[PDB]
Amino acid sequence: KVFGRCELAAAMKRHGLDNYRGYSLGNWVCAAKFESNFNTQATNRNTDGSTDYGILQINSRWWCNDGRTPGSRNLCNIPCSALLSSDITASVNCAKKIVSDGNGMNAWVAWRNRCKGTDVQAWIRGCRL
């Protein structure tokens, strides 16, 4: 499912990402925009045999089980397929663990590259939250 921008912002706010760990909602909307272009079925291989899944491109080496990643741990205790759902609940709950894992939102490379330090309020422009 391709989310609209404000559709996603509303779902992320309902699930508690606004200001979570000190990161405003626009940070999370920005992250999803550049991680997945708001496409809940986005999947991208990394070299290390891991894969990033879903709206927030969560990695199969530590966080979810895809059954093909060597040395995998599954710290969110889900198949990675659960992160390709049309509803974002699994992704959000796993994201909250990742952002608490010692690096804040620096866990999301596209967020670091394209959102960090920018005017992230623009990502909630026009959203009636």
UniProtKB/Swiss-Prot annotation:
Similarity comment text for this entry: Belongs to the glycosyl hydrolase 22 family.
Active-site residues (renumbered): E35, D52
GO CC, alphabetical: cytoplasm; endoplasmic reticulum; extracellular space
Functional note: Lysozymes have primarily a bacteriolytic function; those in tissues and body fluids are associated with the monocyte-macrophage system and enhance the activity of immunoagents. Has bacteriolytic activity against M.luteus.
PANTHER family, per database record: LYSOZYME C
Protein name: Lysozyme C
Highest taxon above the source species: Eukaryota
Keyword Nucleotide-binding carried by entry: no
Location of this chain's protein in the cell: Secreted
Binding site for substrate: D101
Keyword field: Allergen, Antimicrobial, Bacteriolytic enzyme, Disulfide bond, Glycosidase, Hydrolase, Secreted, Signal
Organism whose genome encodes this protein: Gallus gallus (Chicken)
Tissue expression from the record: In the egg white and polymorphonuclear leukocytes.
UniProt key word Nucleotidyltransferase: no
Enzyme Commission numbers on file: 3.2.1.17
Note from the entry: Lysozyme C is capable of both hydrolysis and transglycosylation; it also shows a slight esterase activity. It acts rapidly on both peptide-substituted and unsubstituted peptidoglycan, and slowly on chitin oligosaccharides.
GO molecular function: beta-N-acetylglucosaminidase activity; identical protein binding; lysozyme activity
Quaternary state and interactors: Monomer.
Domain C-type lysozyme stretches: 1-129
SMART domains: LYZ1
Recorded name of the encoding gene: LYZ
Disulfide bonds: C6-C127, C30-C115, C64-C80, C76-C94
Catalytic class of the enzyme: hydrolase
Known catalytic reactions: Hydrolysis of (1->4)-beta-linkages between N-acetylmuramic acid and N-acetyl-D-glucosamine residues in a peptidoglycan and between N-acetyl-D-glucosamine residues in chitodextrins
